[PDB]
């Protein structure tokens, strides 16, 4: 019995792109028609303030001198001068059936994996993971740089049936911190609603709206675009922002990363905070990587031990592995 050469899992917790609008506080209860924010270009004249990595007297100077200015073009998104609140809206869908893979080259490895996942769910439900996901939804982790200097944040979650909304939750996102995972009353109901859809006993579609009060006229920060066709000419634009149909937006995978960061069980000191659930546990913007494959702490070592050699790890590592196959990906040798 070995692990298959082709094995792949789908994605649960499927979000959409968030849309941004601007308005005034205390009109949050009637914010169905607020105008969007727009990305605008601007040209700036600045100084040359960077490390002169060439020589002092360079014959073929790869930069310019300090006594001359440099003129650049950048994108920027702002609030209007009368509006002091930013609204961010997206939708979420919880699918269920997190054990069965899509493709599987092997026959015995698949039903062994199904028996392992089935005895996990029969031992304990999807309660801890849904509680962590409800916490990451409750405090607006997804707003990113728009959450930092905010005066007040509010989150509204709607459960949408065939027609209208059937259940409403309202949270104050600044009391619920980004560090601790505490308990509440409405948060347990939201966690049970997420757990029912994660197990497979229902259809769960949520609508999430977030209001942030950052002062009027200030700057908002949409998702910045990565372009792999643009290249290597003096005269380009340095900053391009993401927008869908003349309206600033945030990518869907960025909100997926913001909802997925529940991992507080990595090898090092996890008192500093949680990171995102992924194989080899890496935060690249900080330049580090927790859960390295030196020890038996990464995803593949735990998974292969648990399935092939029946060695059940600790319950937190079981939570990590089950969240890592809720996430999805290509796991083949």
């Amino acid at each position: 019995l070995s692990t298959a050469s082709v094995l792949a899992f789908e994605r649960k917790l499927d979000p959409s792109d968030a849309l941004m609008s601007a308005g005034a506080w205390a009109q949050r209860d009637a914010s169905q028609e607020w105008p969007a924010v727009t990305v605008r270009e601007k040209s700036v004249r600045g100084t040359i303030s960077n490390r002169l990595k060439t020589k002092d007297r360079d014959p073929a100077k790869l930069d310019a001198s300090i006594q001359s200015p440099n003129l650049q073009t950048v994108d920027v998104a702002n609030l209007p001068s009368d509006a002091d609140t930013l609204k961010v809206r997206f939708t979420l869908r919880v699918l269920g059936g997190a054990g069965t893979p899509s493709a599987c080259n092997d026959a015995a490895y698949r039903d062994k994996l199904l028996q392992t996942v089935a005895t996990y769910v029969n031992e304990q439900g999807f309660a801890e993971l849904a509680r962590r996901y409800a916490h990451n939804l409750a405090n607006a982790r997804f707003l990113w740089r728009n959450r930092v200097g905010a005066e007040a944040v509010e989150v509204r979650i709607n459960h949408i049936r065939q027609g209208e909304v059937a259940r409403t939750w309202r949270f104050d996102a600044l009391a619920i911190g980004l560090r601790d995972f505490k308990a509440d009353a409405e948060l347990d109901a939201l966690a049970e609603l997420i757990a029912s859809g994660l197990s497979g006993s229902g259809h769960v579609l949520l609508e999430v709206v977030a209001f942030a009060r950052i002062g009027d006229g200030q700057e908002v920060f949409p998702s910045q675009e990565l372009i792999l066709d643009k290249g290597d000419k003096k005269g380009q634009k340095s900053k391009t922002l993401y927008s869908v149909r003349d309206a600033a937006a945030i990518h869907s995978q960025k909100i997926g990363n913001a909802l997925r960061t529940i991992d507080t069980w990595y090898p090092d000191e996890d008192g500093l905070g949680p990171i995102a659930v992924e194989p080899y546990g890496s935060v690249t913007s900080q330049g580090k990587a927790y859960r390295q494959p030196k020890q038996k702490l990464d995803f593949y070592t735990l998974l292969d031990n648990w399935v092939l050699r029946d060695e059940a790890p600790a319950v937190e590592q079981q939570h990590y592995v089950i969240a890592n196959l809720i996430r999805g990906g290509v796991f083949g040798e």
Partner: protein, 78 residues
Amino acid sequence: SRPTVVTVTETPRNPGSYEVNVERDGKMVVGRARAGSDPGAAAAKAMQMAMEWGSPNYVILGSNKVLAFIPEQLRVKM
């Protein structure tokens, strides 16, 4: 490459929005400036970037939905 070349290309990251690139003489003077959100604004931005930045010759390139608003083989070349 003597005449000023103006190109209008559609971004595939979201459809229906265009960009314009100008090159006068061996150097790029305008790189990926927002054309618009419909073929009409892209044609208007192309003719504006060809009016200025132009020697006695120029050339405009674009798709077959943007080049319908420009008059047929009259204002496209010089």
